[PDB]
Design a protein around this ligand. Structure first.
Ligand code: BJZ
Length: 180
């Protein structure tokens, strides 16, 4: 349907270069698949700070995932996930930046660890929120639970755990199908 979807992706120092690249490729795969639909996309990299890599209006103008992401630079700092989610809620979903009043808001968060900051994400709560937690830091039920606070309910649907960044490929294949 009419979906305004934002990727919020981790660019902290704990991600290896190849891992950060797998994230970019995942986002391109998704966008390529949903070309020529009612989907609109935006992407934000977060680390210590929050960098909008492209807004919805950027997407409407070009609709080319390669061009939209070509200058992305890995920030290699902290993992301020609380600040990042609030940033998306208030700074990215705006009509002035191409967001649509009647579109469903979706936020896809991709990270390798726990947030380095703190607070709440009240402002983003109405958004449909998936979080993809990847790698060695999420190998136990207890470590995986730390992500639930960022996601819609139930966690069994909205929190995805991958053992490696190579599994983003497999996740895309699975997601591809859910497309009606
Ligand atoms: C199932 N589902 C889903 O897995 N994701 C999802 C989950 C992850 Cl981890 C990553 C990415 Cl990129 C997308 C979604 O966003 C949805 C929920 N959804 C919607 C859309 C609209 C409404 C609504 O209006 O209520 C509710 N949910 C759209 C749907 C979807 C499925 C596959 C792809 C691909 N490729 C992209 C989107």
């Amino acid at each position: 349907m009419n979906v305004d979807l934002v990727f919020l992706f981790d660019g902290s120092m704990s991600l290896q270069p190849d891992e950060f690249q797998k994230i970019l490729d995942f986002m391109k795969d998704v966008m390529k698949k949903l070309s020529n639909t009612s989907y609109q996309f935006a992407a934000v990299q977060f680390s210590t700070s929050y960098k909008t890599e492209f807004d919805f209006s950027d997407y409407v103008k070009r609709k080319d995932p390669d061009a939209l992401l070509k200058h992305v630079k890995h920030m290699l700092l902290l993992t301020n996930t609380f600040g990042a989610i609030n940033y998306v809620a208030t700074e990215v979903f705006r009509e002035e930046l191409g967001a649509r009043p009647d579109a469903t808001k979706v936020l896809i968060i991709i990270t390798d660890g726990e947030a380095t900051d703190s607070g709440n994400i009240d402002a983003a709560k109405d958004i449909i929120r998936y979080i993809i937690g990847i790698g060695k830091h999420f190998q136990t039920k207890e470590s995986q639970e730390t992500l639930h606070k960022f996601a819609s309910k139930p966690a069994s649907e909205f929190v995805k755990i991958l053992d490696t960044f190579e599994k983003l490929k497999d996740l895309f294949t699975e997601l591809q199908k859910k497309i009606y």
